[PDB]
RNA sequence: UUGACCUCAAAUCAGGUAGGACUACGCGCUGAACUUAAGCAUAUCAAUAAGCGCAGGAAAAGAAAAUAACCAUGAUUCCCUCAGUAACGGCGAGUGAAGCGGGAAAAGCUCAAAUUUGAAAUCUGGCAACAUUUCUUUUGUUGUCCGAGUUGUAAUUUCAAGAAGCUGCUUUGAGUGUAGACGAUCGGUCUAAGUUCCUUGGAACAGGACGUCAGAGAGGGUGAGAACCCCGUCUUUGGUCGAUUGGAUAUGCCAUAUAAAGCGCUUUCGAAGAGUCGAGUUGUUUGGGAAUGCAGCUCUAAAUGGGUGGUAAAUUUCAUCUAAAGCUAAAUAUUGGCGAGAGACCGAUAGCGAACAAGUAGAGUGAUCGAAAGAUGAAAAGAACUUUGAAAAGAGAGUUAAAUAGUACGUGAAAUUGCUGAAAGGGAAGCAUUGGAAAUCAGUCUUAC
RNA sequence: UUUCAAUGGCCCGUCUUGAAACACGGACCAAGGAGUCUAGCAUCUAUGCGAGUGUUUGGGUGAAAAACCCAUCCGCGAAA
RNA sequence: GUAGAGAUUCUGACGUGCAAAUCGAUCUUCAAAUUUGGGUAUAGGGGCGAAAGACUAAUCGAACCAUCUAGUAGCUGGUUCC
RNA sequence: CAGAUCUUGGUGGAAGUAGCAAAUAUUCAAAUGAGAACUUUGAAGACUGAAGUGGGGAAAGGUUCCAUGUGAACAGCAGUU
RNA sequence: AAAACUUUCAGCAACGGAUCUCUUGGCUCUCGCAUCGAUGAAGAACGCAGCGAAAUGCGAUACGUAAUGUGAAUUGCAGAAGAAUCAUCGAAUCUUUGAACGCACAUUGCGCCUUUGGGUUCUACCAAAGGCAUGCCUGUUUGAGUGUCAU
């Protein structure tokens, strides 16, 4: 039950930038990201956080490879040079 | 009436297609009718506008004005015609854009690709 | 502008001198842009950049085709030269080994195939 | 439809025809068939006698087809 | 139907009593306009609508086939009365007879010019001109919804065998062409009103 | 709390049923899809009828034993009586039901004459054109796609 | 002592494979509570949410250790019906199937248990040759070595049978071109008719005359409602020419039937899956009630044996089926992804949170939370110039159809505000009724007979 | 219409036996804002047919989510 | 007794504050069970507690976040034209 | 829709009102400028008074540093700073 | 008791953004299709244009290269001259990361292997290229065992 005069001692980060998701959610002492679960192989994901999923799901980034794959599928995955 | 189901009658889709057309598609969207002499000489009703063509304005405040097409300004769907200009307040002159459907082509800038286009569209040259 | 077809009908070493000359030209143009240059110089910057890209494309395609020729009719070839359709497509059974059958099934299909028949009215 | 119904005639009338002294409350008497022996017994006895308790013997795996016997006069 | 999660995608609980505020759910957090605002209510901005519309509403509705057939026969009988045709809005003041029956050579029409010609000698073109002159921009949000224009209904051509009559007549505004074997009440009694003007083909009339 | 006339309510709606509502707005679409697939099969399978012949069997209960319906396939006993081996019956479009049996001569005969009618009206193309082997037809010019129900209905 | 073999290790050994994401729909595991019962503990919610694992274009299921008790049916799936039924339930609240029958779709099969034993007949890999390609990117063939394998790889068999026998009819390629025809297929292309007069307008796309086209009068765009100005629309399930694919056809070549196969009769024989079935028990499940399924523990079969026949037991018959091994298209699902077409939907406080630079700005250590915000005009033609002012600006002028459109921009409501005119007023105001005063105004009339 | 004079006129909504209430809510304006849909049931009413009735599970047919047509079942009713 | 750490009284100032706990005076301690930086450990029916149900990000007789959840309502309020 | 301490947005009376009173304190001339209680220079008067209102660093911030330029907006007066 | 003031009414002007009209958006339905990743995906970070912050696009070949198609633009200015901020798309590039793979990582941190190259400089130093994760499978090679024997 102490407000002001107690916020002035707050100069010690508990989270830093995560190397996987790029967010300021990397707990230093746990060495774990609260956002994406790094360094775990799987990504932190929960069905109660439906909005959290759509904030970072497929399509929110570039999808540079998936766009190329879709173009290649439409024409049947052909290779070589047209004559 | 349209009977194909690959074509859409939606106003939303038709407006989006028109206003989101790329430069190559806008080339065909900017088409102008040929004059009577050209129509009887090429058996063609309409051709896409090209720079350097000779046209006559058929509608608007500039009706009857003639001049060479200086630039088919595709991103606004406008034609800039030589000497079709406006006197600004400061004394400079700003071009007046005319839609391609409001002009009539009176002389074509013929290339070998344009001749191929004319003979490909059921015509002759 | 450098055109790709006469770029392709030259040798690799000759294209190496052209690439190095173009890189030096781009460096000179960038120095001109920072010391104050005209729009003509600043347009040549993009033209030189694309010419460098065209040359580097020609070197790489010549290198890859040479690798393809060297590895032609080899059981094992570099991964980047192999097919890349999808990971699943590369892991699927081939049509040869999808169609492999036992002699029991070969005899059944040989002697009693699905017949072409029809019914009279 | 909707235009020849109520709530188009109660537009303006407070309480929407459910009264002021008692109102329209969610489940003031219980949900479903709750009761029948405690506080719904009057309705249940006078309008649905025989509702509670078992009568007769059970038949396990009853099948109607062996019993199929429609009658004609 | 609306999105079944429209108005509930936010997280907002009631702050309760003791805050001089209505006891509605309110958006938490800070640093935005949405924080502290209402949620989860028909009276609330960006809330859920009352009783959101569902897809499992009854759209299609059953009619007894015998009563459908009753209505079709009644509409065909209505088409046979000149007074009902005039009352419904058909310009048949000059047509030769009701029911108007034309020869089977009409079924072989290949050009719209032939069809509009035949209409002019049978004096059925007043109805077509009425349809053309009645074409208007639809009033309201309909034209925003692929309902751009409205117009009247012209003659209904009924045929038995098709060898060109459909294509020759279908571009004439307001004219509808239907097979006699599959007569539709939506076309026999447009608007629920009886007495449409029907032009019969000889084989169609014989097959009635 | 239930005070009106009528029967006591019985609505089984205490679960999350809206999650599993099934609508039929795709009923006309499925009907057209089944039509198109049926026509695609009709064109693809050649003269062969789109439906194989079926045996005439009796449903197994007192409620339905007075009727005749279509079975699954012809028994091995029926195929032997009709003179068709089980290896060729599947090839010429005669289904085989190894599970069924002929407990009565009546059921046996019923399906035997069905196979005999099918065999009499069946045109079997030679495996190699121009070389008619046993059972192969000599002329196949008149081959057509006909309906097995029309050729041999369930009586 | 060398060797063989077994077992177990190492290598940046040769070549491969696995994870992560996605998860709308699929298969599992794990697993609540709010809620209902007008309390509440069994129950209900619910075999649900959350959690976890693993897939596909579908998945799963599937060729009866299935029903039935019939004149019998005959893999699975889904639909309708059965049926709110049999049944389960403080027999309360509640819950709740299946056989049949009709339809959609249909397709069947593979091993283990057999001595090839006059012949491991089988297969990975290394090497070298050829060939082939959606493809120099793909997929094989032949030869030759090394290995794997007798602690069992092929051929043969799968219970519907079969296997060995007994003559005797019948049937037969895992092939390769090439040619042309007949189909399918993304795609490059091809497409009818006024911009004739008058009026209004800034603009004709309006109104009126006069026409034309229509297998095209869908829909857009263009300076205002355009079939004929433009894109398109119809013709089009098509001409076109460029590659693709399909099933037939013409022959060419390679193919050792020295083989293989169906069928028919056997005086015959017929191998058929074990800590599994079953039983008890304890949990958990089910409509399954004297246990419906599953699981844990204990006990553990059998050989016409073992299941099952929806009341437990012993006994005796009868049907049915053949578990403890395996594959499989179609009909079915699909709040996701991708591509389309729609609509009696919403119309900027609505519709997705987001029509806009939206999961953005901003907040929180963090998990997370999460907005506001569309509209000058046809065209910037965005106000040159003079004048006042330090400037911001004003005033003229100018642009425009319009500045009662000046970007603080369509229209511009109310609250509220200033100005003007009028009026009222001794501690509220508003209202109703009746008339006065002042302002304001219509009817009627004038005419018709 | 405005204002004046004469007479009359408490603040509306709300629960309540009783509100001007020293009972609650209401500073103001605009926009939004609450008996809906579905599975049943019951009375009543309209229509079709009637000892029958119900085409729309499907199939046919339409180039078209419509309309039209259709076999066999089945639901309810004809017996308790 | 100073710095520093505290917080007795005035029940002073302020109390829409300079401040969601501050200021003034007064006062308690001031070389050790002392004060304190950074690193590190302990996490919610848990931690930690020289013990006040204290403290655990202004949240504590069970933190915060999101979901089940539009939880339930014999209770209060509202419920729109003539 | 007049009500729900309704929702969102907008706007009033209070009101030119409460208030802008801790940390001793400023003053004169000149310059600049449209404009000076506040900017700059000089002069004077003062304070922090070495446990500083001085000179540095760590945590935290991130360009706030520096020169030049200045219609607003922000610095709760002003502003040329 | 005239003005002021207050209130009312009207006009004009403010404040405000209702209303009306619109809509490259949303929502719902139907149809069709089946295609991610160790051959490095989804995601993240930093960069890339003559003049760019974002969005969009791309990766040191950086608002793109090749190839195919179309056929003369782009456009705010400048600017040049098979154009193009064009479409398609079968060849390529694809930084630092990420299942993320030499070890790490609030450290452009710390290593090892092979080859090649550099220069006033050569046993030194430096640079470049290609490599070094774990589990499992087939095979190869090298082994270990008072495991079983033969000899
Ligand atoms: Zn992270």
Residue numbers in the entry:
A (entry chain j): 2 to 84
B (entry chain Y): 1 to 125
C (entry chain h): 2 to 122
D (entry chain a): 2 to 74
E (entry chain C): 53 to 260
F (entry chain L): 2 to 156
Quote the authors verbatim.
Here, we answer these questions and reveal how the nascent 60S moves from chromatin to the late-assembly compartment in the nucleolus of Schizosaccharomyces pombe (S. pombe). In vitro, Fkbp39 binds DNA and nucleosomes but dissociates to bind nascent 60S particles and to partition them from chromatin through LLPS.
We analyzed the isolated Ytm1-containing nascent 60S by cryo-EM, which revealed 3 major states in both wild-type and fkbp39Δ cells—each state can be further classified into multiple substates. Notably, these 3 states look nearly identical in wild-type and mutant cells, but their distribution differed markedly.
